[PDB]
Write a protein that binds this ligand. Structure first.
Ligand SMILES: Nc1ncnc2c1ncn2[C@@H]1O[C@H](COP(=O)(O)OP(=O)(O)O)[C@@H](O)[C@H]1O
Lengths: 272, 757
């Protein structure tokens, strides 16, 4: 990955320090916080390190294009912000109480200061601050603009920046679209900050090649409602199973056959 | 295919199966990412509140109070969460919540607020029309003192609903909250807990609210209440709020229905039916109701849903649907709470004594009901005559809408008002003549009703002691009405009231004993005694628990005994273990003597034992705490005392006598134990009175159709059938209830005999 830009006069040593600081974070978090039968799934291995990197490895040159934003951004700043958002979304998700979250973010800030012993005040000013930073998204940042046809051009896909207004406005835009796409949609979805974040997370998992995500939560949390939009934006087809008067096995088999032939021979994108 | 087959799994966090399902299959939680969704915090809820109040703040204009409104609404939601938790904690009855109900609650708030705002403010516009009348009369200037109360109402009613208009907004909020959320709750939690809860929220919030609930009064006009009371709605409070709750009809409802008030009410309310289990129902009845609106009632929910029921639930615009359960204490899924409203029609004893009061007034002499319904119809019509007075006032006030004064006939109109008040005075007198005479005619019987209700709520709880001790209210009603017929009237009506109290108790008592088991014989009578005394004698539940559950001082007695000294030690129980009890003069013989209670009575409290109003219960607390060995005969003893020795006496059921009970249209069950069967005796009787041998079918596998064809032979002919071993092969049982019906006619002399375990 490194030998493409060659513009990292000092960011190479940093990049290696990221390779080691992910490991330091892995050691600390894996040691510290454990599974108990009320938090039994608090289980850590080497998979999550691979997932962290799999998230990092993107934007062969889109990271370089800081010039449009330059929001007090050095090229490295965007990179460490990407590191932070990545580590959060691969480690600071599957935890039950918000306090547990608060301690992992404290760990992250401490480790970032540890490695980043050369611009530490800048990170403290900008991204280590608890204020919202670098919400990463794919469909909001670019607008189709409906020049000659509605889907004028496929939006740029790799990255987005932090903002909440245009996020909600495009979300409401899209909600109207989903209303007229589906007859009798009947979906009064209320979009508040946490709901926006949850849709973002479903996007993060659904998009990735060879990914999937278990979603937990009491009924009414809306996950089943949220995923419909999250799939429509990603162009993925969706099908559910119907339990007939006789509950049996063949329905599963024929449905999976159709699913593969959508994702195989035809090669379309699907979801389950 | 693996590159383009994403899998989205969404599980519950609660229940039983999720955790060991995860343990069963490693790859499931292994490969997939994991994400939690916490419940919404207060910031989200106030955000939703303002998103829905911005578009709904057309009439509710007040700066510096809106923000507190949205805050307090969030507070209400967080609270109904806690109330849910407490209900499950104490009563072990499941309750759930969803944001959908919060949205529906906002819908109700907006809709009924615009309705009541516009309606009551057209009435307040009419208060201002009264101001216009006063102004035009004054500027134009006999009648001005005649309209003293009239101008007072015209001013003060508007000024009250207006200056308290924000407090009335609060009242609307309290009403719509109590509607939307407090459906499935029992009488302790329904009003009391929820009301103190909401008003403390309002006091802490410091937003203004009006004193006094009166939820039913300013919701529905009493004319429709009376109309329903003709349609079989019980005349008491709880049924009133229940009827309101069905009226609002936020979504299709689902009743917890131990008795059947809702089924009869809907059967009468506007209808004057198709069961769930029917091959035609799933296909035929659905399409008829869905394309022509037949209303499709259902009456057999048992937590098991044919999935096709649901997507029908959520397109004729002339179609509704009410469906209800039977067995109490449901275990409905969280989402079945998300879709439909839930209402509990668990009868309280309070309404129960009025219903039994009405039925006894019926059967004891119809002339009492003649007087009752006569005066009741008269006074109901006189309430409507007060309403007609109000109509006359309104006519006097706004029919002319100008030139009232030039109408000198207004003088006659004023006199007419007076005349109507005069018949109200007669009605006023009738309110006295009612509230004593019928009341004493009811006071002769309302003790009885009290006893009846007590008895019923006793025999409810034995069902929880063990299944199969389950019976309706209807059978109890037949027994009650019969008892009145059996022995009630001789002469000397007060003495016959005492004879009610003697006879009804024994009749119901024996009826339940016929089903009871040996080890539960003593217990049912014991519970009956307590439930009798929890109202009249006001026996403390704390003292009951003292009687159920429970050393430095004394030296001779045993450590096994000293446990009991500390048991009794912790009113005068903690006052007489001292030198009084430690005299050790003559009570050593007493503790040695067998039958301590009877001949060598304790003289520790001779006067207290003498009084006997509670002295029995005192003696028994003593007997249990000292000598648990001889508990049971003492149990028989005070049962004989407080209830009569007739109860503590042998019973043996003459099978020839029992046959007289069995009509053709009811079977005979048999809850047997090991090493006992009446089959030989049943056959013997069937050879004695009946002249033919019975036919027999043993349950098992592959015997349904055999049983059915022999039953059809019995139907046409009139023989007897002996089913056997119903404790397995239960799929045929549900069919039997449909078979034994008035529809499919049956030849006389046909009996059925059932045995099971
Ligand atoms: N964010 C939300 N705002 C309003 N209503 C919601 C929201 N999320 C869910 N609901 C309600 O809950 C119902 C079920 O949603 P669902 O997606 O099944 O939640 P879950 O997956 O947690 O069961 C929906 O029909 C909807 O009315």
């Amino acid at each position: 990955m490194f030998k493409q830009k060659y513009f990292s006069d000092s960011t190479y040593k940093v990049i290696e320090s990221l390779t080691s600081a992910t490991i330091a974070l892995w050691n600390k978090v894996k040691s510290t916080m454990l599974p108990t039968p009320a938090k039994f799934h608090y289980v850590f291995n080497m998979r999550e390190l691979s997932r962290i990197f799999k998230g990092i490895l993107t934007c062969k040159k889109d990271t370089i294009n800081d010039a449009p934003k330059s929001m007090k951004i050095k090229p490295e700043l965007f990179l460490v912000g990407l590191w932070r958002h990545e580590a959060e979304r691969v480690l600071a998700d599957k935890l039950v109480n918000n306090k547990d979250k608060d301690t992992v973010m404290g760990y992250i800030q401490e480790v970032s200061l540890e490695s980043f012993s050369q611009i530490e005040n800048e990170i403290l000013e900008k991204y280590s601050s608890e204020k919202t930073f670098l919400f990463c998204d794919f469909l909001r940042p670019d607008v189709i603009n409906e020049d000659g046809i509605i889907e004028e051009e496929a939006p740029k896909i790799y990255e987005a920046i932090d903002s909440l207004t245009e996020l909600r406005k495009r979300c409401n835009f899209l909600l109207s679209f989903y209303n007229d796409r589906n007859p009798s949609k009947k979906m009064p979805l209320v979009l508040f900050d946490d709901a926006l974040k949850h849709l973002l997370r479903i996007s993060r998992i659904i998009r990735q090649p060879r990914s999937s995500g278990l979603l937990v939560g009491v009924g009414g949390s809306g996950k089943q409602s949220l995923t419909r939009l999250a799939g429509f934006i990603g162009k993925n087809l969706i099908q559910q199973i119907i339990v007939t008067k006789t509950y049996s096995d063949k329905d599963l088999k024929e449905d999976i056959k159709k699913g593969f032939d959508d994702a195989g021979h035809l090669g379309k994108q699907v979801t389950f | 295919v693996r590159d383009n087959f994403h899998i989205m799994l969404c599980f519950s966090p609660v229940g039983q199966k999720f955790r060991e399902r995860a343990r069963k299959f490693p790859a499931l939680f292994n490969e997939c990412t994991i994400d939690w969704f916490l419940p919404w915090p207060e910031e989200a809820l106030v955000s939703v509140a303002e998103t829905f109040i911005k578009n709904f703040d057309k009439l509710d204009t007040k700066e510096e109070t809106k923000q507190e409104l949205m805050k307090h609404m969030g507070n209400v939601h967080l609270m109904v969460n806690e109330i849910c938790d407490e209900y499950y904690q104490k009563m072990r009855r499941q309750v759930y919540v969803t944001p959908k109900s919060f949205l529906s609650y906002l819908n109700s708030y907006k809709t009924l607020y615009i309705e009541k705002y516009d309606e009551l403010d057209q009435q307040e516009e009419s208060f201002k029309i009264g101001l216009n009348k006063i102004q035009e009369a004054t500027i134009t200037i006999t009648l001005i003192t005649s309209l003293s109360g009239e101008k007072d109402r015209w001013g003060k009613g508007a000024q009250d609903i207006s200056d308290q208009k924000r407090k009335l907004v609060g009242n609307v909020s309290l009403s719509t909250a109590f509607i939307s959320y407090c459906g499935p709750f029992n009488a302790e939690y329904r009003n009391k807990l929820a009301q103190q809860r909401f008003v403390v929220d309002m006091k802490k919030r410091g937003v203004p609210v009006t004193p006094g609930l009166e939820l039913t009064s300013f919701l529905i006009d009493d004319a429709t209440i009376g109309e329903w009371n003709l349609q079989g709605l019980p005349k008491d409070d709880l049924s009133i709020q229940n009827g309101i709750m069905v009226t609002n009809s936020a979504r299709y409802p689902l009743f917890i229905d131990p008795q059947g008030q809702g089924q009869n009410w809907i059967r009468n309310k506007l209808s004057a039916i198709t069961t769930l289990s029917h091959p035609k129902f799933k296909d035929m009845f659905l399409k008829y109701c869905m394309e022509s609106g037949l209303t499709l009632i259902v009456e057999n929910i048992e937590n098991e849903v044919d999935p096709m029921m649901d997507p029908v639930l959520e397109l004729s615009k002339e179609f509704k649907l009410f469906m209800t359960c039977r067995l109490a204490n449901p275990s409905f899924s969280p989402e079945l709470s998300a879709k439909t409203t839930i209402i509990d029609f668990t009868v309280t004893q309070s309404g129960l004594e009025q219903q039994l009061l009405g039925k006894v007034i019926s059967k004891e002499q119809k002339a009492l009901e003649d007087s009752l319904n006569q005066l009741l119809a008269d006074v109901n019509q006189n309430q409507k005559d007060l309403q007609r007075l109000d109509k006359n006032l309104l006519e006097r006030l706004i029919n002319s809408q100008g030139n009232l004064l030039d109408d000198t006939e207004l003088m006659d109109v004023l006199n007419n008002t007076k005349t109507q008040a005069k018949e109200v005075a007669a009605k006023l007198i009738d309110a006295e003549i009612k509230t004593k005479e019928i009341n004493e005619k009811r006071e002769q019987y309302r003790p009885v009703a009290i006893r009846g209700s007590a008895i019923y709520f006793t025999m409810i709880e034995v069902s929880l002691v063990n299944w199969m001790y389950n019976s309706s209210l209807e059978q109890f009603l037949k027994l009650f009405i019969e008892s009145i017929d059996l022995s009630e009237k001789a002469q000397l009506p007060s003495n016959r009231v005492k004879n009610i109290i003697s006879f009804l108790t024994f009749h119901v008592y024996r009826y339940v004993n016929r089903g009871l088991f040996e080890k539960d014989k003593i217990t049912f009578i014991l519970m009956m005694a307590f439930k009798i005394l929890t109202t009249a004698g006001t026996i403390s539940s704390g003292d009951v628990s003292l009687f159920l559950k429970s050393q430095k001082q004394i030296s001779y007695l045993e450590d096994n005994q000293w446990l009991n000294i500390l048991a009794l030690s912790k009113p005068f129980f903690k006052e007489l273990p001292d030198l009084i009890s430690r005299s050790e003069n003559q009570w050593r013989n007493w503790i040695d003597k067998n039958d301590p209670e009877n001949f060598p009575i304790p003289d520790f409290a001779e006067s207290i034992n003498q009084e006997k109003e509670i002295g029995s219960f005192i003696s028994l607390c003593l007997v249990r705490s000292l000598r648990n060995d001889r508990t049971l005969i003492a149990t028989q003893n005070f049962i004989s005392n407080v209830l009569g020795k007739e109860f503590t006496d042998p019973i043996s059921y003459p099978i020839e006598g029992i046959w007289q009970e069995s009509s053709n249209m009811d079977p005979v069950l048999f809850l047997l134990s090991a090493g006992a069967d009446p089959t030989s005796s049943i056959d013997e009787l069937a050879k004695k009175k009946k002249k033919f041998p019975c036919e027999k079918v043993s349950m098992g596998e592959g015997q349904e159709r055999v049983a059915r064809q022999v039953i059809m032979k019995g139907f046409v002919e009139g023989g007897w059938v002996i089913l056997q071993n119903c404790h397995l092969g239960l799929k045929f049982m549900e069919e039997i209830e449909t078979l034994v019906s008035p529809i499919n006619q049956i030849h006389e002399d046909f009996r059925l005999w059932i045995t099971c375990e």
